[PDB]
Structures are given as structure tokens and as C-alpha cells.
Amino acid sequence: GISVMVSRSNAFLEPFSADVWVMMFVMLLIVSAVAVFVFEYFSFTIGKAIWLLWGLVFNNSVPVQNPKGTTSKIMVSVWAFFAVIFLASYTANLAAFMIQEEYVDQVSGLSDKKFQRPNDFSP
Amino acid sequence: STLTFENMAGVFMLVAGGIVAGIFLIFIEIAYKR
């Protein structure tokens, strides 16, 4: 027939999809309400307690207060290991997309605009 | 011819299960305090 020969060429949400990012948004409201509701009964909160429970999502060494309570911090310990298994899952799938990497290519055939455009199409 | 909730779907039930189980242990501390 007739073909064209070319050389070979040399996005955080691109791995996975938009399906995941609509979930932890719920956890943002849920975890914030849980801590205040537990603290409200026994009797911070919006001002400061929101920092720790969102900060727990990220394994960072930021110096922050540690709320006391024999049972108050029991659930946050349960809430603690949800993130590590989440992030380990959240990074394992990333390597899969490098396995599933595609070739971007440049043209689609003789009928492409680039071939049909002598000038006015960059260099 | 990109996972789904899958394991996280049961996590939320465990997350919700912890919330209802939280009030169970709330009275336990009160029980020993009295």
C-alpha cells in the first residue's frame, strides 16, 4: 500500500479516574462531625480539632495537640489505620497505569490536517 | 479494550460500625466511674 515512517517520541488524576475523588469528600464531612459529636456529649472543635483528623489523613510530623480521653482517642486510632491502607492502595494502582501506558502518537494518516497544512501550522 | 469502592465499601461499614460501637464503649467508662 502506502504508509508513513516516523521516529519514536521521548496528570495526577490520569491514574484511576474521577470516581475515587468523590468519596473521601464524604469522609471530610463525616470525620469532622464524628469528633465533635463525641466531644459534645462528655464536653478545639471547629477551631482546632479539624486540624488533627484531616491531618491524620497525611502521615506528617507536624507538631499538633493530642486530645486526651480514655475513650475519646479510641475511635481515632481505628480511624488511623484506614489512611495507611488507603494510601498504599492509592499508590499501588499508580504503578499499574505505567504498565497500561499508551502511545500518544502524532498523526492519524494522510488525511490529517498536519499533512494537509503546508504552512500556518507552527514549524 | 481503575478499581472501585470494593474494599473501601466494606471499610465504610467498618467506619460506620465503629461509630455505633463507639457509644457502646462510652458507657463502659461511665460504668467503672460509678
From Swiss-Prot, chain A:
Organism: Homo sapiens
Protein name per Swiss-Prot or TrEMBL: Glutamate receptor ionotropic, NMDA 2B
Domain notes: The extracellular N-terminal domain (NTD) endows NMDARs with a unique capacity for allosteric modulation, harboring several binding sites for small molecule ligands that act as subunit-specific allosteric modulators of ion channel activity. A hydrophobic region that gives rise to the prediction of a transmembrane span does not cross the membrane, but is part of a discontinuously helical region that dips into the membrane and is probably part of the pore and of the selectivity filter.
Effect of N93T: Affects glutamate-gated calcium ion channel activity resulting in increased agonist potency and mutant channels activated at lower glutamate and glycine concentrations
Transmembrane segments: 18-38, 72-91
Family label: Belongs to the glutamate-gated ion channel (TC 1.A.10.1) family. NR2B/GRIN2B subfamily.
Quaternary organization: Heterotetramer. Forms heterotetrameric channels composed of two GluN1/zeta subunits (GRIN1), and two identical GluN2/epsilon subunits (GRIN2A, GRIN2B, GRIN2C or GRIN2D) or GluN3 subunits (GRIN3A or GRIN3B) (in vitro). Can also form heterotetrameric channels that contain at least two GluN1 subunits and at least two different GluN2 subunits (or a combination of one GluN2 and one GluN3 subunits) (in vitro). In vivo, the subunit composition may depend on the expression levels of the different subunits. Found in a complex with GRIN1 and GRIN3B. Found in a complex with GRIN1, GRIN3A and PPP2CB.
Function: Component of N-methyl-D-aspartate (NMDA) receptors (NMDARs) that function as heterotetrameric, ligand-gated cation channels with high calcium permeability and voltage-dependent block by Mg(2+). Participates in synaptic plasticity for learning and memory formation by contributing to the long-term depression (LTD) of hippocampus membrane currents. Channel activation requires binding of the neurotransmitter L-glutamate to the GluN2 subunit, glycine or D-serine binding to the GluN1 subunit, plus membrane depolarization to eliminate channel inhibition by Mg(2+).
Gene name of this polypeptide: GRIN2B
Covered residues, full protein: 533 to 679 of 1484
Effect of I99F: Reduced localization to cell membrane
Tissue specificity remark: Primarily found in the fronto-parieto-temporal cortex and hippocampus pyramidal cells, lower expression in the basal ganglia.
Curated annotation (Swiss-Prot), chain B:
Compartments where located: Cell membrane; Postsynaptic cell membrane; Postsynaptic density membrane; Synaptic cell membrane
Modification note: NMDA is probably regulated by C-terminal phosphorylation of an isoform of GRIN1 by PKC. Its phosphorylated state is influenced by the formation of the NMDAR-PPP2CB complex and the NMDAR channel activity.
Phenotype when changing G10R: In NDHMSD; loss of glutamate-gated calcium ion channel activity
Residue ranges of the TM segments: 7-30
Pathological condition linked to this protein in its record: Neurodevelopmental disorder with or without hyperkinetic movements and seizures, autosomal dominant: An autosomal dominant neurodevelopmental disorder characterized by severe intellectual disability and developmental delay, absent speech, muscular hypotonia, dyskinesia, and hyperkinetic movements. Cortical blindness, cerebral atrophy, and seizures are present in some patients. Neurodevelopmental disorder with or without hyperkinetic movements and seizures, autosomal recessive: An autosomal recessive neurodevelopmental disorder characterized by severe intellectual disability and psychomotor developmental delay, involuntary and stereotypic movements, spasticity, and inability to walk without support. Intractable seizures manifest in some patients.
Oligomeric form and interacting partners: Heterotetramer; the NMDAR subunits are modular and harbor tiered domains that function in concert to regulate opening and closing of the cation-selective ion channel pore. Forms heterotetrameric channels composed of two GluN1/zeta subunits (GRIN1), and two identical GluN2/epsilon subunits (GRIN2A, GRIN2B, GRIN2C or GRIN2D) or GluN3 subunits (GRIN3A or GRIN3B) (in vitro). Can also form heterotetrameric channels that contain at least two GluN1 subunits and at least two different GluN2 subunits (or a combination of one GluN2 and one GluN3 subunits) (in vitro).
Family statement drawn from the similarity comment of this UniProt entry: Belongs to the glutamate-gated ion channel (TC 1.A.10.1) family. NR1/GRIN1 subfamily.
Annotated domain remarks: A hydrophobic region that gives rise to the prediction of a transmembrane span does not cross the membrane, but is part of a discontinuously helical region that dips into the membrane and is probably part of the pore and of the selectivity filter.
Protein name per the record: Glutamate receptor ionotropic, NMDA 1
Organism the protein comes from: Homo sapiens (Human)
Protein's gene: GRIN1
Section of the entire sequence shown: 800 to 839 of 938
